[PDB]
Amino acid sequence: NWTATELLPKLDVPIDLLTHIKLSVGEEMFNNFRLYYGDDPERYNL
Amino acid sequence: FALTVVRTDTFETDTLLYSTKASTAVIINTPIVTKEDRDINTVFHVSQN
Amino acid sequence: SFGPMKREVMEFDPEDPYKVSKMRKLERSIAKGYVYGADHQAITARFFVRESLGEVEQKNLGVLMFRLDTGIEMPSTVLVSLFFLSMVAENVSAATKNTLAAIYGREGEAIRTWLRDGAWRLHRVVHPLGCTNSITPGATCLITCSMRGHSYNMLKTEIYPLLVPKEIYLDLDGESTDEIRFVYFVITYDYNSDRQGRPSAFVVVSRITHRHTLINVLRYRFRVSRFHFLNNSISGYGPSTGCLGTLQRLGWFCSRDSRSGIVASRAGQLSVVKLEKFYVDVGPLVEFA
Amino acid sequence: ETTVLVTFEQRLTTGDVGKLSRLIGAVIPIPYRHHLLGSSQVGLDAVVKDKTRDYSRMRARMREMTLTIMRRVEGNQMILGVPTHGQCYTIRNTGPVSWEKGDVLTTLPPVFSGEVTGLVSVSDWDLVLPWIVPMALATEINQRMMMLALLSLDRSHEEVRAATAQLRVVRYRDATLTLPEIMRNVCISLSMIANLSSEVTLAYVRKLALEDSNMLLMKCQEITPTEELNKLTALFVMIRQITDVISEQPAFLVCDVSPDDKSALCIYKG
Amino acid sequence: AWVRQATGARRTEVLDSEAISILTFGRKTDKGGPALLHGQRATCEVIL
């Protein structure tokens, strides 16, 4: 689930990237990714 | 050859329904009132799920 | 003076570009509570459906409703999906036809198979309505079909995508761009020997706004029926059919939302083209030979 | 909303206001969108005044006549809400044809052939509801009245006269209508299109027959330059003056028809 | 013609395209008869 991830309060921890986060989905340093662009009402759908 | 006529026949009938005390539970929500608009009126549709 | 004084209170009043409909949605919220019907640009209308058409519409949201003006007096107006006319369009593959004919034609639809095919689509029996949000499967299926707007779940919870099947989408694609792209609806008539021939149908997407430049690039692709159009026009002195193409505006969307999908239903699967933030802009029929 | 008052220039009956309260949904055509107007300017009655002027001229002034919907009637004032595009509106189906869910509606001038009944008149003033007929049927009314002018000449043949009579009954869903005999200046413009196009095209097929795009000028061939200036000008100017009275500029898409078939919520167009 | 002049003198006011509508979305073609005194009437037949 991703709505649970968004609605639970997160810890703030710094994260390191290779070059860029939109380019990270090419060589896929992070598997099982979800991407938003703008406003997303599916965090408000319950 | 013979012929059998079969036929159903309707009987409007008072049926008694006995249910035990608190047999089934109904849970309701608060009635939501949705909107639709016209020149003649606004038709509201109220609902309990 | 008190003439001017009563006007300024009216003119200090507008603090919004309207501040009219907002005062409507507040006092109607005074009437019962939160109204579900305030935050709504999209305007819908409610369609009571013959219960044998409780199919893919019932399962997936966002399909295009059409009326049939069938000439049959006692049943005339049958509500019709965009998936529904896939069984008539020779554009659409025949295996795709018998796929959704096994969906729709479960002992409650086969009239419309003969009625669309025999009593052929004059591009006057079909009329655009919009898209389906809030299907109500009850006793009578209540399609609350939109008329002008984006289709969405209530409280804007999930914007319902437009479903367009793949065999009617591909053959009139536009170009590769993404700023805005439209949906127009196109019916094209090839002529063979005896009838209109279960002719064709199209969901064309394009960036072209203008009418006359859009129908010119249809001539880029529909010379073949236009071969047959004048052929039956010189082979017919006296008989007449109707002109070659019929186009109308159907809606605009963001065009970066391009992805096609597949629906999983009765009698297998069906690949569609899933137009996400589709707005319904019903335009007039523009016929062209 | 965008509001228009009507000055009741005629002394209203209290009872006739009760029939104007029976037309709360109805359309009210207006010659120019303005807050003040006279009640004589309410309706197309200002168009229906000249007997010699025909259904083309009745449709021409209607095309300039700004459509407006009734909002409510209050005593000596009639309040009219002008329909803003992109919004649904209940208009009153006093048309002979019961509308159905999704039909596109086109205004037409009224017809006094067998269904002549007057209107909601009070003190020598009827406003006259121009029937907001379907767009599909409005093209059909267009096609009948031109060719019944085309058959108006040869009435002395009974076979043409019998061809007029079966043609003139306009049959649509759930209701039919008879229409009146006679649009002459319209059908002069029709016949000049069909006559001149059989002659003037022969010089321009053959040079375009050399290089072609859709490869049909083979089959299209199988069908003084100052004079040639004047013919093709007179060819195109008849097409413009007929498409003015062919294109019907749609006005309402009925999203659903109310039961009892007296009202219909309609998203507004045009 | 002789069979239906004997009994049941109506075939089809409809054409076949309307007749398929009768066959599928079943029209209540026989209207309530103009003379009915003991509720709705009823029948079916099995040949033996």
UniProtKB/TrEMBL annotation, chain C:
Keyword vocabulary terms for this entry: Capsid protein, Host nucleus, Virion
Recorded GO MF terms: DNA binding
GO cellular component: viral capsid
GO biological process annotation, one example: viral capsid assembly
Pfam families to which the protein is assigned, alphabetical: Herpes_VP19C (PF03327)
Annotated protein name in UniProt: Minor capsid protein
Origin organism lineage: Viruses, Duplodnaviria, Heunggongvirae, Peploviricota, Herviviricetes
Gene that encodes the chain: M46
Automatic annotation (TrEMBL), chain D:
A Gene Ontology molecular function term of the record: structural molecule activity
Superkingdom of origin organism: Viruses
Protein name: Uncharacterized protein
Record keywords: Capsid protein, Host nucleus, Virion
A GO-annotated cellular component: viral capsid
Entries under InterPro entries matching the protein: Herpes_capsid_2 (IPR002690)
